[PDB]
Design a protein around this ligand. Sequence first.
Ligand code: UDP
Ligand code: UDP
Ligand code: ASO
Ligand code: ASO
Ligand code: MN
Ligand code: MN
Lengths: 263, 263
Amino acid sequence: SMTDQAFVTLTTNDAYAKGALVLGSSLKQHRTTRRLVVLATPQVSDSMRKVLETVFDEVIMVDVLDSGDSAHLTLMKRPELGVTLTKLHCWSLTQYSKCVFMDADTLVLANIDDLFDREELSAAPDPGWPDCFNSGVFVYQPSVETYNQLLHLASEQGSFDGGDQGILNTFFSSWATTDIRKHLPFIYNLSSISIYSYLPAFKVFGASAKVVHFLGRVKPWNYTYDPKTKSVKSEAHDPNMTHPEFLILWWNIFTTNVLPLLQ
Amino acid sequence: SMTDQAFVTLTTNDAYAKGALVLGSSLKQHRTTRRLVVLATPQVSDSMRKVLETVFDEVIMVDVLDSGDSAHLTLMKRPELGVTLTKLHCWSLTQYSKCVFMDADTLVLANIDDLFDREELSAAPDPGWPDCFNSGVFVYQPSVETYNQLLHLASEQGSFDGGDQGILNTFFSSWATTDIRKHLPFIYNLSSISIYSYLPAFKVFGASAKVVHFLGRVKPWNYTYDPKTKSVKSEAHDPNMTHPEFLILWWNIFTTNVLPLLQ
Ligand SMILES: O=c1ccn([C@@H]2O[C@H](COP(=O)(O)OP(=O)(O)O)[C@@H](O)[C@H]2O)c(=O)[nH]1
Ligand SMILES: O=c1ccn([C@@H]2O[C@H](COP(=O)(O)OP(=O)(O)O)[C@@H](O)[C@H]2O)c(=O)[nH]1
Ligand SMILES: OC[C@H]1OC[C@H](O)[C@@H](O)[C@@H]1O
Ligand SMILES: OC[C@H]1OC[C@H](O)[C@@H](O)[C@@H]1O
Ligand SMILES: [Mn+2]
Ligand SMILES: [Mn+2]
């Protein structure tokens, strides 16, 4: 229990705000004792900001930070993620002594308040390149020093992937090789692509999942959900449909807890 | 150092024996001072065993160990890997105090004799589920105790993925959470699939790669290579073709170094 520690998320538009809302709802569901904070930029509508105020203890307006790095973003095939540099504002939140940042496309499945036992920078390994941490869930300490060092590095050097993850890994470059206690178990940031890629591991370990992360171009809010049967329409090879359980949980929380505030 | 330490690989047939030949040639190219050993099973042809003896210091004949676990292997979509339990015989090699096991579908790009500074069990994270280690490159200590404990666990419990990686992860279950010194840098076991999945990380870190691992169903020896133009034919969506230079290097070593020994 601590009023000086928070979960922090980010939304730059009304689309990811549906994500932020479901995440915040899920953190209340599993009885967090910490504060809930969302960083929002001007493109979030006034009405949505009001809705965010019903779920989050603080809605904090910040300016968009955009890498403009079309070259590296294309290398990822995620041309829209330049605005993820806006995440660096999470370090300015000095009213808190420790925070957990969580992407707006994450969903909590159990209480995760034990993450506040960890020190900056604690994060889980990225399934793409596991000597990099995934920047969707991380434990950090707000700091005027670190905030400004991060903004400066972003201005001068940018990010190797055009978004927040590259520059955060570059700044926190010791992560792969020092202190194992700063490696969060993969169940605190379980990307649906690891479910597709090594299903045997998911079958043996996935019952312990604490956070699922709907990493990649297609987000839960882009699906067509039917509330009657509790199914989504799916195309092609969709790693989210290996264990569609998590996507359906996202939609059930959205439909019951969030949608009524929206329409 | 020279005499009581080895690199150890495995081949159960003449197909993977081509990979072992390239692997061994590559370890010689980079001037290892350790022994080179290959485990082989009766399906390997007599003529192919003779060729292996011209590259490896010793060819050690072992019995195939097969999980027969079609249900778990099907989850991976690798119905053929039950015979990978044969890898457990690497622990019987008590003529050596320390070994580095390397999958026959690996390729060495620089001297990696510094792996012998590591202690059992040291291995790189698996890109699919990075709280499991990839069993394609690992540092271990031959032991009659450990060998027999592994065979017993295999016989009574089997493997969660029907192959060696599940059982080795279960047996060495502390790897994810203890001693960061047992986490080998991902450059000592670089899956071609990580190049496709987070290409921006490969562009910044990939030049330091020491080992490449052609993990997955399609192996280098399944491609049609043209030696005249130094090209392969390939089909749509092939992670080996993101950075095809590793595949072409495999084929160049095979064509130049191994093909003459098969005469
Ligand atoms: O247009 C955008 C893109 C990203 N985000 C925020 O930045 C995070 C990171 O982007 P995303 O999850 O899409 O990246 P991925 O996890 O798929 O690589 C999101 O979860 C949001 O919190 C946002 O607010 N608006
Ligand atoms: O039919 C087989 C399959 C596997 N292997 C050996 O077991 C290892 C593991 O198999 P593989 O690399 O195909 O698994 P992956 O790395 O693709 O998951 C190979 O590199 C070989 O050394 C073998 O000798 N014969
Ligand atoms: O940097 C690009 C992206 O890399 C992966 C992380 O999940 C995400 O939060 C970040 O925005
Ligand atoms: O267990 C399945 C497979 O996973 C990848 C490992 O490199 C391989 O050796 C093993 O056979
Ligand atoms: Mn995300
Ligand atoms: Mn392999």
